[PDB]
Design a protein around this ligand. Structure first.
Ligand SMILES: [Cu+2]
Ligand SMILES: [Cu+2]
Ligand code: NA
Ligand code: NA
Lengths: 621, 621
């Protein structure tokens, strides 16, 4: 069967047994990450080797280890001790989240701060947030979370409506100590509830919405074989799933006649960062890398039919490891379905008398994740005409603070006394490119305005220019919406019938990139987010734009250290890293639960095919 | 009944009778435009006055007239003779299109050019194109079309595959004379056919697409009363239709509790321009204003159920006038339906235990038009959360030329010997703004980056700034995608419960604007297309960004002459004009019929509501 098949419960169980038998998984060990490794370049013929990478945490303070095992041969391939003070901490563990509140509830400094606010400790929830790296020297080499407090008036109350401002604490979750408690002053706790299921707030529910019924009476047009291989409307791909990255697309290819033509070898969201723009010392530290620090796949929702996914849905239920190596099924974690997408092509010709209309369709693969107050949907779309699109949907409850009486330049007011600090949500797409094969290059395409003059006497001419990125030192690119800047990935060795290199064009949304000062901690840790486009030469170990261990790592790992090798990327095995994101200035309409906002990107064929690839689509039945 | 109701056949018949009885519509007269006039400001209480504006052409060369009539009182209100050499020609007449080919088929210069190419005149179609204004002094005050030739090998052949390059002709369609024939040299006529219904080209049609069935078993959630008044999910509006602008939305308002709150008084696409970027003297003149010169409403398609509009569709069939004043029904010219739009809001809360998911919906109002080789879809979307969106869909067959053997910087090659010149498709949205009433202003909102320093010691802070546009001379604005530039329309006299002015935010796509040299003919005639945003003070006669008579008008009418009045726009009755468009570098995949590409804009509430307006949406049935 396929080497790109999903991990099964049995494989996870076997990794558990191998590690135990090898002495690597005793009672003081915890698995902080487990995932299958992709096959190495050009080794699929033949022989299975299913290998898994494991990050093993030690809750007794001993050094963690990175381990790779072969489930085919039942062996441990390698086992490195990690010096986390140099190369960064392991991802946050789920059992460590609930330790923050518990420790604080018996710390005298915390209880003193609550008493001065007349707050009952049994009502105070603590949001456990990743720490970053700032000026606190004692944290280096220690596993730290920071906590901000919210009040729950009752067990089903939305705590986000009652931020406790002026107060923050730092905790060591291994030695189980509260390192600091900072109390910069009392702010009133906003009193209005934010309970969006309370009939008091919603009023009577609408009776006016009539049902929309979407069915496929003959079933769906796509087929699934081998668990996770998709065939749909000439597209072929494998849908993987990784506890860190979430959904991963492999071997995206298009059937052009009787040739299977590759387009993308691997597509993932390889990192995200959510930086906050409030200079208050209570929150000026707050940034999370949901992918790199928390592992977004681990928090995927089970998607409910008719609520989260509407129509004729096919589900995948991926298997991940819990902290002790037992398999855990994420039931209905991935939805797949096809959707009507309006008109594909249309023309009514007066001279020939022929009227022609064809409809478009897209196939959808999606999952949702929840991290604290935030909920993110990741959507991949494949269209009939060769287009590939990614869309992120951001919703949930906004992170709140008090709203200061003098006003604020960095927080918006959502309700009396209630603020929402400004922030961004930024994504890094990692596109391991394979346009008709692995010899690819990237060109920057700009519109060119031309001047009135000889050979352009009416001043109507305009044109375009393409610049080839030949080395990585050249390949850190910025958007330019004014000149219509796009990027083309082409194969110089594969030509269409017009003798031009086949290609795909990446269309960005041209949203603002990372806004923080370039000398800040977050700019160094999220260097990838300061530019719109990076191209690297493919390498086995260069998987993430921030490095492998983002938790509490200092500046510079990942992309800026990859491109310093200045490797040749002109007709080579290349990887495209695209940064895109939302700048969120919260609005009153985002409260008390926010409507979805979206951002993303798309790729469209650009001389890839010898003509339109949808000439053989039939008229609607 | 409503003064915003659609014109009926009876009203058109009456305008015909009034004009005839008044001596204004004899056998040598032709109606070049007829449309109802909007009610004047603050006169709806009470008394009907249905008035119509008419442009009357004279085919005997006498001066045309602008006439307004009252159908209520059966009177002619005013009748002005027009000096077309000063203020521009009337829109092209449909009967004039077919005159170009016929006259050329008996002109000796045309026949000599065809003979030298070994072309049969009975096979040569001529595309009749609007003329513009260039250096040909004899055209001033004359009604001129220009013709480019294509070969049809047989009556059902797609002529666009066989451009006849190096040849162009100019014709006077009133005196029925060929003024010039220009033959710059013979180019081979591309021989490959472009027939997308021929099984030779399509191959066998796919059998793999299974049906997608979209039904509403209880009918749709919107209601239609009075012919064209829509109520849907707290939205209220009237759908008008004008032969020039196409679909027009009136009185867009939202039911916030028991208050009907206005948002937009009138929304239309008030102009488009399609400029070509080929400096060849054979095409360097070619620009059309499809709205202003051809009247896009006049060429709307009848939309076929299950092909053009899928689901539970409600149709409007607008009535327009033909060239003699008889009513003509455009059957099924407008589709309306609601659509599922994925997840509206979602949050799974760990502390409260409450999981919450709600789905989104949009209502769609659309029509399609066909002008020669081009087909355009105009789509208005209303969302549950207050969002309003416009989308243009561009498809059809690309306009073609020969592809020169040396190559070309301004044409792309689609097939052996076949080129497609570079061009843009640019739209002007006219939004007569009424945010909670008519006292509105516009602010430009920019992201503000902040520097590491005191009060921002960690260098994470960022902010925003708003600049009020106080006078029209201030109100010609450019996009800036890097700083996230948006524009806010607010009512300074109407505040939400937080004491902030209510507002709506316009989100642009930030595509390139008009690329032609600023000294060119097209830059002066399409001045509106050189900037992204204009704001004017409302005035009755300022309806179009290019002026009333765009055909063969010289530079400067419309928007740049409106803003020179430098009127106060700070808390006044204002109009927002937004330019947006596509820059089309044609690709091989656009041939032989092109897949849809899209562009548009949206407006989202920004402190308009006192909280989320979709708290009262129920869980999916
Ligand atoms: Cu946000
Ligand atoms: Cu085009
Ligand atoms: Na690659
Ligand atoms: Na207005």
């Amino acid at each position: 069967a396929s080497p790109f098949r999903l991990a099964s419960a049995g494989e996870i169980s076997e990794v558990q047994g191998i590690l135990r038998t090898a002495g690597l998984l005793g009672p003081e060990k915890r698995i902080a990450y487990l995932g299958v490794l992709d096959p190495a370049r050009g080794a699929g013929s033949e022989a299975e080797d299913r290998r898994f990478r494991v990050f093993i945490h030690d809750v007794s303070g001993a050094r963690p280890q990175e381990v790779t095992v072969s489930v085919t041969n039942g062996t441990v391939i390698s086992a490195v001790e990690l010096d986390t003070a140099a190369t960064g901490e392991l991802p946050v563990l789920e059992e460590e989240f609930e330790v923050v509140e518990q420790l604080l509830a018996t710390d005298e400094r915390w209880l003193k701060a609550l008493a001065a606010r007349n707050l009952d400790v049994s009502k105070v929830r603590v949001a456990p947030l990743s720490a970053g790296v700032f000026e606190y020297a004692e944290e280096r080499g220690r596993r730290i979370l920071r906590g901000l407090a919210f009040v729950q008036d009752f067990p089903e109350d939305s705590a986000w409506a009652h931020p406790v401002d002026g107060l923050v604490a730092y905790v060591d979750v291994v030695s189980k100590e509260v390192t600091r408690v900072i109390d910069t002053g009392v702010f009133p706790v906003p009193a209005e509830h934010g309970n969006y299921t309370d009939p008091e707030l919603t009023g009577p529910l609408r009776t006016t919405q009539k049902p929309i019924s979407i069915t496929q009476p003959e079933g769906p047009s796509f087929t699934v074989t081998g668990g996770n291989h998709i065939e749909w409307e000439k597209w072929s791909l494998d849908v993987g799933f990784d506890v860190r990255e979430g959904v991963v697309l492999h071997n995206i290819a298009f059937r052009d006649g009787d040739r299977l033509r590759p387009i993308i070898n691997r597509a993932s969201i390889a990192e995200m960062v959510v930086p906050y723009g409030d200079p208050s010392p209570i929150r000026s530290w707050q940034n999370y890398f949901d992918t790199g620090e928390y592992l977004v796949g681990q928090y995927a929702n089970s998607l409910e039919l008719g609520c989260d996914c509407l129509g004729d849905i096919t589900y995948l239920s991926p298997v991940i490891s819990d902290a002790f190596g037992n398999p855990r099924e994420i039931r209905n974690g991935i939805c797949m379905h096809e959707e009507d997408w309006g008109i594909l092509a249309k023309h009514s010709d007066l001279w020939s008398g022929i009227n022609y209309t064809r409809r478009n369709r897209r196939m959808v693969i999606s999952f949702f994740t929840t991290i604290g107050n935030y909920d993110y949907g990741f959507y991949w779309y494949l269209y009939l005409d060769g287009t590939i699109e990614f869309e992120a949907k951001a919703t949930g409850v906004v992170f709140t603070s008090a709203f200061p009486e003098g006003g604020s330049d960095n927080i918006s007011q959502l309700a009396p006394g209630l603020g929402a600090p400004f922030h961004q949500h930024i994504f890094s797409a990692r596109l391991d490119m394979a346009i008709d094969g692995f010899t690819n290059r990237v060109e920057e395409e700009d519109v060119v305005r031309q001047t009135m003059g000889p050979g352009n006497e009416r001043g109507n001419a305009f044109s375009r220019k393409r610049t080839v990125l030949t080395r990585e030192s050249e390949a850190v690119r910025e958007a330019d919406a004014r000149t219509g800047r796009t990027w083309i990935i082409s194969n110089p060795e594969s030509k269409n019938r017009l003798n031009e290199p086949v290609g795909y064009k990446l269309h960005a949304h041209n949203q603002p990139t990372l806004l923080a000062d370039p000398g800040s901690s977050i700019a160094r840790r999220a260097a990838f987010a300061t530019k719109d486009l990076w191209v690297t030469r493919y390498a086995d170990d260069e998987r993430y734009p921030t490095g492998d261990f983002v938790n509490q790592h200092s500046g510079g790992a990942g992309l800026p250290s990859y491109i310093a090798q200045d490797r040749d990327i002109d007709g080579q095995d290349i990887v495209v890293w695209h940064t895109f994101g939302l700048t969120h200035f919260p609005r009153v309409e985002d409260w008390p639960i926010m409507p979805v906002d979206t951002v993303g990107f798309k790729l469209r064929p650009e001389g890839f095919f010898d003509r339109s690839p949808v000439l053989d689509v039939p008229a609607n039945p």
